[PDB]
Amino acid sequence: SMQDPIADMLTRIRNGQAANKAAVTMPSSKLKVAIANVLKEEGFIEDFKVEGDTKPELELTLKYFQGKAVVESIQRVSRPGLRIYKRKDELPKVMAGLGIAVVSTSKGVMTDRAARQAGLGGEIICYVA
Amino acid sequence: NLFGEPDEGIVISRFGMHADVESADGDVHRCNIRRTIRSLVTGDRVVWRPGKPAAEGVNVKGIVEAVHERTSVLTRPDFYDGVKPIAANIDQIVIVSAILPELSLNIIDRYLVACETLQIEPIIVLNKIDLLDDEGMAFVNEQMDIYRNIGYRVLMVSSHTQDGLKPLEEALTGRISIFAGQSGVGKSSLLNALLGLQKEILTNDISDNSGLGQHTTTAARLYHFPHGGDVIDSPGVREFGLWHLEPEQITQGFVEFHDYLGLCKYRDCKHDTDPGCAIREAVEEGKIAETRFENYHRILESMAQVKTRKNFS
Amino acid sequence: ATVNQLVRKPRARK
RNA sequence: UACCCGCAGAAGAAGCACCGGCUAACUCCGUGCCAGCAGCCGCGGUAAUACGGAGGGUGCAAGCGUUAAUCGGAAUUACUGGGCGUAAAGCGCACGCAGGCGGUUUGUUAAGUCAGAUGUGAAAUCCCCGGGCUCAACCUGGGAACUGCAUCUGAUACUGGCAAGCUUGAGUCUCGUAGAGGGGGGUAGAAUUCCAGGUGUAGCGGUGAAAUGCGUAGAGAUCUGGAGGAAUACCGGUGGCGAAGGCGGCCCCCUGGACGAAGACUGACGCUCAGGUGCGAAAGCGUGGGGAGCAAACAGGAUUAGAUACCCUGGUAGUCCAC
RNA sequence: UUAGCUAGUAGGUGGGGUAACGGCUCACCUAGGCGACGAUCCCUAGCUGGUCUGAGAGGAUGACCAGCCACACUGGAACUGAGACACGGUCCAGACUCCUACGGGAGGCAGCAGUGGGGAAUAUUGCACAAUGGGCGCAAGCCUGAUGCAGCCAUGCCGCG
Ligand SMILES: Nc1nc2c(ncn2[C@@H]2O[C@H](COP(=O)(O)OP(=O)(O)NP(=O)(O)O)[C@@H](O)[C@H]2O)c(=O)[nH]1
Ligand SMILES: [Mg+2]
Ligand SMILES: [Mg+2]
Ligand SMILES: [Mg+2]
Ligand SMILES: [Mg+2]
Ligand SMILES: [Mg+2]
Ligand SMILES: [Mg+2]
Ligand SMILES: [Mg+2]
Ligand SMILES: [Mg+2]
Ligand SMILES: [Mg+2]
Ligand SMILES: [Mg+2]
Numbered sequence: 019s020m021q022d023p024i025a026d027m028l029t030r031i032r033n034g035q036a037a038n039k040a041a042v043t044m045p046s047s048k049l050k051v052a053i054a055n056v057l058k059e060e061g062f063i064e065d066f067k068v069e070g071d072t073k074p075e076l077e078l079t080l081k082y083f084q085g086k087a088v089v090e091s092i093q094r095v096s097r098p099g100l101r102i103y104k105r106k107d108e109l110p111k112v113m114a115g116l117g118i119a120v121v122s123t124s125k126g127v128m129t130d131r132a133a134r135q136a137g138l139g140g141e142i143i144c145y146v147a
Numbered sequence: 148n149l150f151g152e153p154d155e156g157i158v159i160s161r162f163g164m165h166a167d168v169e170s171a172d173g174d175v176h177r178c179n180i181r182r183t184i185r186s187l188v189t190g191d192r193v194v195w196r197p198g199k200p201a202a203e204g205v206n207v208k209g210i211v212e213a214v215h216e217r218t219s220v221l222t223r224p225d226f227y228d229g230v231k232p233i234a235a236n237i238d239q240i241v242i243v244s245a246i247l248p249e250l251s252l253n254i255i256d257r258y259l260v261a262c263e264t265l266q267i268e269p270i271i272v273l274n275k276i277d278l279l280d281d282e283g284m285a286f287v288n289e290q291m292d293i294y295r296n297i298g299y300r301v302l303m304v305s306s307h308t309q310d311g312l313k314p315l316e317e318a319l320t321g322r323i324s325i326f327a328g329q330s331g332v333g334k335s336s337l338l339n340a341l342l343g344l345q346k347e348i349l350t351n352d353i354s355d356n357s358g359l360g361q362h363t364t365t366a367a368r369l370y371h372f373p374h375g376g377d378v379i380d381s382p383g384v385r386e387f388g389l390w391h392l393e394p395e396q397i398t399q400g401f402v403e404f405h406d407y408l409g410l411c412k413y414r415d416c417k418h419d420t421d422p423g424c425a426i427r428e429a430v431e432e433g434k435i436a437e438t439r440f441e442n443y444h445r446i447l448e449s450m451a452q453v454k455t456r457k458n459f460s
Numbered sequence: 461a462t463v464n465q466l467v468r469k470p471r472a473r474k
Numbered sequence: 475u476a477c478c479c480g481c482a483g484a485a486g487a488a489g490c491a492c493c494g495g496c497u498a499a500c501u502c503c504g505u506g507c508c509a510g511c512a513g514c515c516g517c518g519g520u521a522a523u524a525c526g527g528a529g530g531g532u533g534c535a536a537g538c539g540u541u542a543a544u545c546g547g548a549a550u551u552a553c554u555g556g557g558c559g560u561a562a563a564g565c566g567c568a569c570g571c572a573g574g575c576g577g578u579u580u581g582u583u584a585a586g587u588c589a590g591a592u593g594u595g596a597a598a599u600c601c602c603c604g605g606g607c608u609c610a611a612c613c614u615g616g617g618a619a620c621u622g623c624a625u626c627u628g629a630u631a632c633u634g635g636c637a638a639g640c641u642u643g644a645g646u647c648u649c650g651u652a653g654a655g656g657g658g659g660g661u662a663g664a665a666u667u668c669c670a671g672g673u674g675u676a677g678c679g680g681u682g683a684a685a686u687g688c689g690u691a692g693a694g695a696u697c698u699g700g701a702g703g704a705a706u707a708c709c710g711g712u713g714g715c716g717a718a719g720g721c722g723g724c725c726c727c728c729u730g731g732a733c734g735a736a737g738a739c740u741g742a743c744g745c746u747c748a749g750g751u752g753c754g755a756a757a758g759c760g761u762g763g764g765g766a767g768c769a770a771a772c773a774g775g776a777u778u779a780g781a782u783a784c785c786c787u788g789g790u791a792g793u794c795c796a797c
Numbered sequence: 798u799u800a801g802c803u804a805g806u807a808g809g810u811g812g813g814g815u816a817a818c819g820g821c822u823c824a825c826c827u828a829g830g831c832g833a834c835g836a837u838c839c840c841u842a843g844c845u846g847g848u849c850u851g852a853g854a855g856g857a858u859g860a861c862c863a864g865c866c867a868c869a870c871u872g873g874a875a876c877u878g879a880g881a882c883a884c885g886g887u888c889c890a891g892a893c894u895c896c897u898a899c900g901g902g903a904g905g906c907a908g909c910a911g912u913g914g915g916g917a918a919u920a921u922u923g924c925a926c927a928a929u930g931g932g933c934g935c936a937a938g939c940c941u942g943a944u945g946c947a948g949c950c951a952u953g954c955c956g957c958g
């Protein structure tokens with residue numbers, strides 16, 4: 019079903035980015051806000067808005083270069099069938115340090131570049147390539 | 148490698164990968180064949196070397212190097228197989244038949260055409276005659292009197308009765324004989340009553356059907372007469388290869404039709420729809436039976452049906 | 461292909 | 475003993491394998507699918523760099539080849555890092571326990587995970603910087619590593635547990651609509667065959683052509699009447715329904731799901747499935763009925779070399795129902 | 798193509814037992830115990846630090862070095878002693894060989910070599926306690942086929958002519 023809504027979130031981003039869609043909407047949650055707000059601060063997307071309180075609806079503004087996909091590919095890493103965890107020195111890089119890896123720790127959701135100054139490890143969410 | 152003495156011997160049988168070779172005294176010694184040999188049949192004299200025994204007295208095989216020239220040959224073609232010789236180096240053929248399961252006459256006529264192209268004398272021999280009555284025996288004897296006026300010797304025997312074996316042996320000495328026939332016509336049983344061979348195997352005999360015959364015994368196994376000569380068994384064969392020559396040779400394949408050629412109206416004649424056929428006048432007179440005449444044009448109409456796709460050697 | 465399938469029985473080495 | 479001095483003179487000290495491609499290196503002669511060669515591809519019956527020999531070369535080296543064994547190559551049991559429409563592979567289908575997994579909001583726990591620290595992970599081996607044996611192999615100093623386990627102190631985003639929820643997931647009610655969904659019980663009219671009667675005469679029947687068979691006791695054909703059996707033309711269509719195999723005259727009775735509209739309502743009640751469970755074309759089997767037509771085996775006639783099959787005339791089991 | 802296994806078995810009481818807890822043992826009481834997270838049965842195997850292979854993850858394996866367990870012709874038992882159910886201690890049975898005056902006794906190379914035999918295949922029936930380590934003794938000293946060595950085997954690696 020919708021057992022991995024983060025994988026459902028990454029499905030809706032990769033489709034609309036490739037099919038030249040201007041903006042998408044999706045059901046919101048606390049975890050989907052904490053990931054899209056990081057992608058807004060890392061130049062991958064443009065803006066996010068929330069709509070509705072009894073039915074929380076998250077919106078994302080897409081981003082293009084000259085009509086080209088900014089987010090070329092994104093890869094869900096951990097999953098409910100197999101959980102993935104790393105330490106503070108085993109955090110993997112994406113495209114040898116070009117792409118970022120979204121890792122949620124006890125100090126909130128940050129990147130692997132931001133986790134070096136934080137010195138923590140935890141759950142890998144997605145490889146933002 | 149490491150072969151023995153080149154000598155002349157008679158090949159007993161054929162087994163594809165190897166052959167059974169009788170020496171100059173009667174020693175059963177199996178040998179394989181040379182890769183350049185195009186064909187090897189039952190009862191063909193060859194040049195061969197019996198290998199070399201690895202253990203003292205215990206040898207496995209030898210080789211058959213060369214093949215001598217053929218005196219006669221029995222070549223019959225087949226669909227998708229080509230012209231294949233069956234046997235060779237023989238002076239007499241014996242057509243063996245039985246009343247059970249059937250006794251046809253078209254099976255008789257095309258072995259006569261083949262023997263006219265090979266200068267061999269076929270002999271008509273009927274088996275299983277003890278099961279009929281004298282009313283039925285006289286009718287079959289009347290059907291064989293047509294085959295007596297055409298010059299071929301007809302000897303009518305039975306294996307389970309031992310009737311007429313002694314006149315069959317006297318005309319058969321000094322020669323090699325193919326016991327040609329169909330499936331389950333008493334070929335193996337007549338070999339038992341004439342030879343007196345070793346009764347420990349003595350043949351493979353399974354011919355049990357509802358109205359048909361079964362071919363259990365294989366291609367050809369060689370033996371010897373108590374007087375002289377050899378025997379050659381035949382398979383149960385229901386095949387007719389007439390791809391050899393022109394239909395002018397079909398006119399030469401029958402004995403009494405030699406004396407009536409050149410008597411019709413035209414110099415070329417199909418003898419079926421042509422007006423004034425003197426051969427057809429000989430059948431209508433009664434000197435030639437109409438069973439042979441109607442089967443003669445069945446041979447010609449069979450060549451309108453076999454020739455259809457194509458075949459050439 | 462499923463990891464949870466290989467929990468019951470691993471890949472059979474010939 | 476290592477070591478060192480002194481002596482004599484290049485004197486005492488190089489071979490094996492390969493040479494078509496893979497794979498470094500080419501000519502000649504002999505041989506004639508024979509002998510042999512070979513890990514693979516496959517070379518040699520009259521010109522073989524592939525066989526044998528010579529000349530020449532190549533790769534190694536006091537070693538050189540071969541055989542056997544293990545991993546690698548092989549992502550060729552694919553966690554990293556494979557596939558399942560037709561190359562090997564999605565159970566015939568459905569229900570469902572255990573197992574795995576799970577919407578959303580808040581609090582709590584700190585289980586999992588993460589941070590730090592302690593203890594421990596024997597030495598040797600491997601790695602880092604050195605030292606030493608004339609060198610190297612080898613020996614050896616310290617460090618790193620040994621990604622491990624245990625305990626304590628922390629953080630709470632995610633996962634787990636508890637607690638309270640929420641409604642878009644999944645369900646419930648009403649109003650409806652469509653349908654060959656299944657089971658049971660009746661019924662209809664053609665057509666087939668059988669039988670009764672009437673009129674009526676030489677063939678009917680069958681095939682490419684014939685024959686078996688049937689018919690002057692009157693067949694066949696037609697008409698009237700009756701019996702039995704099974705199937706439902708047209709409608710009828712990549713049309714509908716059912717989990718699937720499948721399901722079609724009409725009507726009644728019992729009963730299953732699917733879908734649409736308007737709201738109300740419970741509050742994750744869910745997805746999935748090893749064994750297990752049930753359904754499941756037709757043939758066949760057991761018991762007892764039933765019997766038209768069709769039709770294995772089989773009977774008969776043609777066909778044929780033989781006909782066993784094809785073709786034709788008959789015909790049992792079976793096809794029908796209950797279990 | 799192993800699904801049920803188990804009656805001293807699972808637990809409790811008391812007695813007994815060992816250096817120590819304990820069905821370790823005995824009488825009694827309870828009917829549990831184990832198990833689809835592989836009980837039980839069958840087959841194979843000393844294990845590990847490691848070595849080899851591989852970019853890594855993995856894979857194969859456990860010779861020499863070191864740690865532990867087990868074994869000392871086969872099977873069983875106890876004594877002695879702080880420590881053994883004891884390789885060169887004993888007792889009993891069995892197997893094999895040797896000695897014998899025929900009644901009886903003797904022996905355990907999986908210790909160093911070495912012979913027979915097996916197999917494609919693996920060594921001298923050598924020297925020394927000089928050193929190290931252990932044993933006895935106040936020490937001296939003695940003993941140690943541990944070990945130190947030497948030879949044989951291009952068996953491997955490295956270096957030179
Ligand atoms: N009553 C009877 N039976 C006979 C006679 N001859 C032969 N038979 C029988 O016929 C059968 C056929 O004999 P067989 O020789 O085997 O036939 P075949 O032709 O050799 N057969 P195949 O084609 O396999 O070689 C046997 O069972 C044999 O006993 C005879 O004269 N009378
Ligand atoms: Mg025979
Ligand atoms: Mg060579
Ligand atoms: Mg030549
Ligand atoms: Mg060297
Ligand atoms: Mg091998
Ligand atoms: Mg692999
Ligand atoms: Mg593949
Ligand atoms: Mg396939
Ligand atoms: Mg299916
Ligand atoms: Mg260490």
Ligand SMILES: [Mg+2]
Nearest residue numbers: 597598615616
């Ligand atoms: Mg150290």
Ligand SMILES: [Mg+2]
Nearest residue numbers: 598599600614
């Ligand atoms: Mg070291």
Ligand SMILES: [Mg+2]
Nearest residue numbers: 606608609610
């Ligand atoms: Mg140096």
Ligand SMILES: [Mg+2]
Nearest residue numbers: 632633634635
């Ligand atoms: Mg939670």
Ligand SMILES: [Mg+2]
Nearest residue numbers: 664665666667
């Ligand atoms: Mg009707």
Ligand SMILES: [Mg+2]
Nearest residue numbers: 640739740741
């Ligand atoms: Mg409510």
Ligand SMILES: [Mg+2]
Nearest residue numbers: 758759760791
């Ligand atoms: Mg039956």
Ligand SMILES: [Mg+2]
Nearest residue numbers: 783784785786
């Ligand atoms: Mg038929």
Ligand SMILES: [Mg+2]
Nearest residue numbers: 759760791792
């Ligand atoms: Mg039945």
Ligand SMILES: [Mg+2]
Nearest residue numbers: 810811819820
């Ligand atoms: Mg007690």
Ligand SMILES: [Mg+2]
Nearest residue numbers: 840841842843
């Ligand atoms: Mg063992």
Ligand SMILES: [Mg+2]
Nearest residue numbers: 862863864865
């Ligand atoms: Mg040891």
Ligand SMILES: [Mg+2]
Nearest residue numbers: 868881882883
């Ligand atoms: Mg012991």
Ligand SMILES: [Mg+2]
Nearest residue numbers: 869881882883
């Ligand atoms: Mg003992």
Ligand SMILES: [Mg+2]
Nearest residue numbers: 884885905906
């Ligand atoms: Mg001893």
Ligand SMILES: [Mg+2]
Nearest residue numbers: 906908909910
């Ligand atoms: Mg020894």
